[PDB]
Amino acid sequence: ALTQPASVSGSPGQSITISCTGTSSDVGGYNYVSWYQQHPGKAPKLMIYEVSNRPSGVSNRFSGSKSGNTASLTISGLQAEDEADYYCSSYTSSSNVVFGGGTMLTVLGQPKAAPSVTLFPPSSEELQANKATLVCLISDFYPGAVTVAWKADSSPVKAGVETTTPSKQSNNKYAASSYLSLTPEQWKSHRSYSCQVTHEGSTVEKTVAPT
Amino acid sequence: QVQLVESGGGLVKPGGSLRLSCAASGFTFSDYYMTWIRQAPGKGLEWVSYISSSGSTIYYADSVKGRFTISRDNAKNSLYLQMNSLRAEDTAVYYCARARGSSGWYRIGTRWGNWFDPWGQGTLVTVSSASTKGPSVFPLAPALGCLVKDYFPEPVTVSWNSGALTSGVHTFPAVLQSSGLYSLSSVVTVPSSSLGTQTYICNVNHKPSNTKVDKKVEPK
Amino acid sequence: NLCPFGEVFNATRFASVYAWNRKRISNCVADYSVLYNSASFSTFKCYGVSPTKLNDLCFTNVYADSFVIRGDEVRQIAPGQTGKIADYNYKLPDDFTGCVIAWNSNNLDSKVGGNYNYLYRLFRKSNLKPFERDISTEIYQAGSTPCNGVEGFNCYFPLQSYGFQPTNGVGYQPYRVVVLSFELLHAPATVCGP
Ligand SMILES: *[C@@H]1O[C@H](CO)[C@@H](O)[C@H](O)[C@H]1NC(C)=O
Numbered sequence: 163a164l165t166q167p168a169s170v171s172g173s174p175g176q177s178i179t180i181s182c183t184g185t186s187s188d189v190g191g192y193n194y195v196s197w198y199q200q201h202p203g204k205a206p207k208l209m210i211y212e213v214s215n216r217p218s219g220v221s222n223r224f225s226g227s228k229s230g231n232t233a234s235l236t237i238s239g240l241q242a243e244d245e246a247d248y249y250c251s252s253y254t255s256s257s258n259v260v261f262g263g264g265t266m267l268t269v270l271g272q273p274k275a276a277p278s279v280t281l282f283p284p285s286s287e288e289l290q291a292n293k294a295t296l297v298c299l300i301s302d303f304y305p306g307a308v309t310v311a312w313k314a315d316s317s318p319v320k321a322g323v324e325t326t327t328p329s330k331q332s333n334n335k336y337a338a339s340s341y342l343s344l345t346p347e348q349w350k351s352h353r354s355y356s357c358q359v360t361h362e363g364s365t366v367e368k369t370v371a372p373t
Numbered sequence: 374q375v376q377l378v379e380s381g382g383g384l385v386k387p388g389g390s391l392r393l394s395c396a397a398s399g400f401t402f403s404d405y406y407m408t409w410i411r412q413a414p415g416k417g418l419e420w421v422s423y424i425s426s427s428g429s430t431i432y433y434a435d436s437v438k439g440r441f442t443i444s445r446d447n448a449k450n451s452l453y454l455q456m457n458s459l460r461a462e463d464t465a466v467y468y469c470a471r472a473r474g475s476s477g478w479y480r481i482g483t484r485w486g487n488w489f490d491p492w493g494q495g496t497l498v499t500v501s502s503a504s505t506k507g508p509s510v511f512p513l514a515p516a517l518g519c520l521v522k523d524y525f526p527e528p529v530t531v532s533w534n535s536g537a538l539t540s541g542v543h544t545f546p547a548v549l550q551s552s553g554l555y556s557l558s559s560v561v562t563v564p565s566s567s568l569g570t571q572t573y574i575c576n577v578n579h580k581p582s583n584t585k586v587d588k589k590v591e592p593k
Numbered sequence: 594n595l596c597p598f599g600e601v602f603n604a605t606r607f608a609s610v611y612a613w614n615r616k617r618i619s620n621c622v623a624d625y626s627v628l629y630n631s632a633s634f635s636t637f638k639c640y641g642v643s644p645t646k647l648n649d650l651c652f653t654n655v656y657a658d659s660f661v662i663r664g665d666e667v668r669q670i671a672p673g674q675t676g677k678i679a680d681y682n683y684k685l686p687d688d689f690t691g692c693v694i695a696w697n698s699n700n701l702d703s704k705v706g707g708n709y710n711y712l713y714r715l716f717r718k719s720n721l722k723p724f725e726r727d728i729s730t731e732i733y734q735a736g737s738t739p740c741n742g743v744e745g746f747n748c749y750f751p752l753q754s755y756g757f758q759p760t761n762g763v764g765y766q767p768y769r770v771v772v773l774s775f776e777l778l779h780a781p782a783t784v785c786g787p
Contacts, residue, residue, distance in 0.1 A: 191744055196488040198418070205468060205495060206418065211488035217473070249418045253487040257432050259408075264417035280560060282518065285511040286593065297513060297520055297558050299545060324556075329546045339545045339558060373593070404710065474756065476709040478606065481730065485709035485754050 164189070164250055164262035171268035172240045182233045182250035182262050190231035194253035197226055197235045200264075201246045202330050210235060237267075242334055245269045274362060275335055277303035281357045281368040284349060294349040296342040296370060298357035305362070306336030313356035314348075375399035375491055379469040382496030384505050384526050384581045389459050395452040395469030395493055402450040404475035406486035409443065409454045411465040412495070419465070421454070423486070426477030459500045466495035499526040499581075506554060507582030510575070512590035515568060518560040519575040519588060523552070531559040532576045568592060596623035596784060601657045607702070607769050610682035611714040611752060612728050613660040619783045623655065634696045635768070636667055641690025641775060648786035655784050656691075656774035658683070661702055661711045663755065665764040667695045670772065681714040683772075686723035691774040702757050702767035709754040711767065716751045724774075 165183045172178035182189065189195050195213045198206035210216055210226035213233060223238045233252070237244055245268060251261045277300045284294040300308060306328040312319040325340040340357065349355075350372050358367040379395035393409070409421040422433045422443040431443055442455040452469055470489035476482030508524035521529050531544050538561065547557035559575065569592060577586045596618050608614035625647040629637070642650055662670070662678055669679040672689045679685075702708055716733035732740040733751045740748030757767045 186743075192484075194484065194487050200418075205492040208473065208488055208490040211473065217490070247417075251418075251420065251487070253484065257483045258434065259420045259423070259487050260434075261410075261418045261420055280516050282513040282520075282558075285514065285520070288509075288511045288520075291509075295511075295520060295522065297518070299518075299558055299560055301543060301545075324548050324550050326546060326548045331543075337543065337545055339548060341548060341556065400704075404704075404708075474707040474709045474754075475704050476754070478710045479712075481712075481752070482709060484750075485707075485756075490706070 163260045164252065166248075166250060166262035166265045168263070169266045169268060171270055172237075173270050174240050174242065176240055178237050178240055178267070180235045180237075180248050180250075180265050180267070182235070182252075184231050184233070184252060184260075186231065187255040188252045188260060189228065189233045189250075191255055192253050193228070195226065195228060195233040196251045197224075198249045198251070199244075199246045200249065202332065206249065240269055242269045242272055245334055269334075272304060272334060275302055275304045276364070277301065277308060277359055277361050277366055279357065279359050279366050279368045281370050283355075283370040283372070284346075289346050289349070292346055294344045294346050296344070296349075296355055296357070298340040298342070298359075298368070299337075300339060300359050301331070301337040302333070302335045303337075303361055304335045306330065307361070308336075308338055309360040310338075310340040311356075311358050311360070312340070312342050313358065315353045315355075377469055377471060377491050377493040379467065379493040379496050382467065382498045384499050384501065385459050386502055387460060387500055389500075390455065390457045391459065391498060393454040393456070393467055393469075393496060393498075397450045397452070397471070400471070401475075403447045403477070405477045406472040406482060407443075407445060407452045408470045408472070408489055409452075410468045410470055410489070410492075411463075412468070413462075413465045416465075421467075423472075423483070424452070425480060425482065425486075430480040430483070432483065456498075459498075461500045464498060464500050466497055468495045469493040497526075497528050501526060503553060505581040507584040508556075508577060508579055508586075510577050510586040510588050512575070512588055513558065513560070514590055515592050516560055516562045517573055517590045518558050519577065519590065520556070520558050521577050521579075522556045523550075523554045524556070524579050524582070524584075525554050526581055527555060529555070529557060529577060529579045531557075533559075533561055534572070534574050535576055538573070594621050596621040596655075598623070598628060598657070601659055601771055602628070604659070606710075607659055607661045607698075609710075609712040610660045610662050610678055611712060611726075613658050613683050613726060615726075616657040616659070618655045618657060621784060622787055623784055624787060628694065634694050636693065636695035636770075638671070639692040640672060644692060650775070651777075651782040651785040652775045653778045653780050653782060653784070654776055656776070658772040658774065659770065661698065661755075661767050661769055662713070663764065664697065664766050664768050667693075667768050667770065670695070670770055677715055678713065680720045681717045681727075682721070684721040684723045684725065685772070689723075689774075690776075691772060693770065693772050695768050695770040697763070697766060698769045699757075699759060699761075699766045702769070703759040703761065704757070705759060707754075707756040707758055708767075709756055711755045711757065712752045713755065714751055715753050716749055 197210040376398040472486035473490040476485040544559040736747035
């Protein structure tokens with residue numbers, strides 16, 4: 163219900179501000195505005211309370227301010243580890259707490275990184291269960307946009323592909339995975355199988371063979 | 374030392390009821406306001422409700438009012454959320470959190486009980502008419518891994534040697550198939566010298582189906 | 594049939610000054626040696642009669658008022674004092690006949706995240722009369738601009754939290770105060786010594 167920008171971005175070392183707009187009945191009515199940061203797969207962490215108080219241990223780069231019906235969280239000296247989601251909350255005239263929609267903060271200028279591809283063939287047990295799955299694991303790559311292509315021997319495959327969306331890791335890079343599901347007949351019937359991942363205008367290829 | 378562990382999540386059909394609990398350690402539970410906050414997958418934080426020390430001061434969010442009941446047992450150090458008439462829009466991670474400051478003895482203490490620390494890990498609640506499946510667990514032999522295949526719903530938890538092996542483990546996010554079922558892979562990159570002598574056990578737990586599998590992964 | 598002082602002094606939780614607790618003690622024999630022959634207390638100043646001789650006196654009722662304040666403000670718990678606590682929270686009369694007992698409770702009433710369960714009144718349109726209790730949370734009008742139940746500039750919530758933390762200085766640490774009031778009114782003596 164409190165309005166936040168969906169995303170913001172700054173360059174490292176600069177100062178950056180995140181606004182949180184409410185009404186007379188919440189941020190403008192009380193001095194009880196809290197800020198939380200959330201990293202992927204972790205619970206939120208309180209950074210600011212009572213508009214401007216910082217708990218002990220939180221970096222001094224974080225500070226909170228209020229003016230009118232808009233609270234602000236400001237980060238001095240951006241660092242790559244500040245890239246996370248940020249949420250504002252405040253106490254209401256009805257004695258509720260409402261949060262804002264959240265803000266994904268991006269830190270620019272981080273180095274590009276090539277993906278680490280790791281392709282696996284079907285297991286012996288899974289083939290004894292008359293199914294075949296080839297597993298392609300892509301990790302430690304940045305920016306987070308890749309294209310996955312499957313090549314049966316040297317010809318493209320479009321059937322039996324399910325690929326994930328890229329997900330952010332703790333080190334600010336991205337991971338993803340693609341799956342090719344095939345018959346045991348089709349697995350044993352071909353020379354090779356290929357998972358090749360194209361990331362920022364270059365390609366990585368891994369190939370797997372029946373054995 | 375301070376610890377907040379919430380349980381009771383899983384699969385529930387539309388219109389069903391589910392009860393979440395949160396067990397507290399390391400602080401005098403009786404003195405604080407306790408909250409439930411929830412977060413839909415890919416979505417923002419949404420405050421749900423909070424309760425005072427006696428249980429006589431309760432506030433709910435509008436989205437949740439008339440359907441959820443918050444309650445507390447101070448002797449057992451536990452917080453509960455009773456959810457009723459669930460709809461799919463209630464699918465979310467439910468976090469249990471404590472007000473950083475103790476202000477629970479008063480109805481007025483909501484003023485000083487509205488910033489939260491610590492939080493629990495959260496519990497996934499899925500409201501779906503589909504039925505729980507359970508995974509098939511296969512080894513990914515030579516980097517070693519486990520393919521946890523065709524389960525529903527989320528989440529699945531993977532660990533290695535009962536979670537004594539952390540160094541070099543990356544559990545990948547699951548994939549949603551056109552079936553509507555989930556699969557994930559967990560990889561551990563290990564030294565090639567330890568590839569034949571060391572023992573590598575992959576532990577898979579899928580609570581919605583009560584599925585606990587241990588698979589040993591060895592080279593072929 | 595002994596007078597239940599333990600319930601007041603040994604309570605797990607104390608009241609806030611602005612909503613100070615009062616306990617009426619009546620129809621019992623009061624062993625005053627339990628309180629006064631103790632090494633617990635950090636402040637023990639009687640004003641009407643001496644505590645040693647307490648057992649030889651006799652009263653209609655005795656009133657045990659209890660609350661928590663800062664160390665700095667224990668001085669204000671005395672006849673003819675002024676200040677935030679004396680004027681707005683708890684006022685004793687100039688003809689006070691009783692005892693003020695106070696002790697440091699940092700181990701009980703301070704928490705690392707802040708203990709906000711103890712409040713006080715910092716704004717009020719007039720000074721309290723002796724032994725008045727004000728529990729109102731009406732928004733305080735501090736200027737000419739009126740507050741129609743809404744908080745803003747010059748319109749303040751009248752109550753504030755101490756936020757007691759363990760790291761505070763002794764003057765800022767919580768103290769539990771019990772004030773004993775001995776009234777001998779038009780009625781018979783219903784509380785007495787052994
Ligand atoms: C309240 O506390 C102690 C606890 O052991 C009890 O023995 C005592 O008699 C009581 N009264 C006091 C301390 O005045």
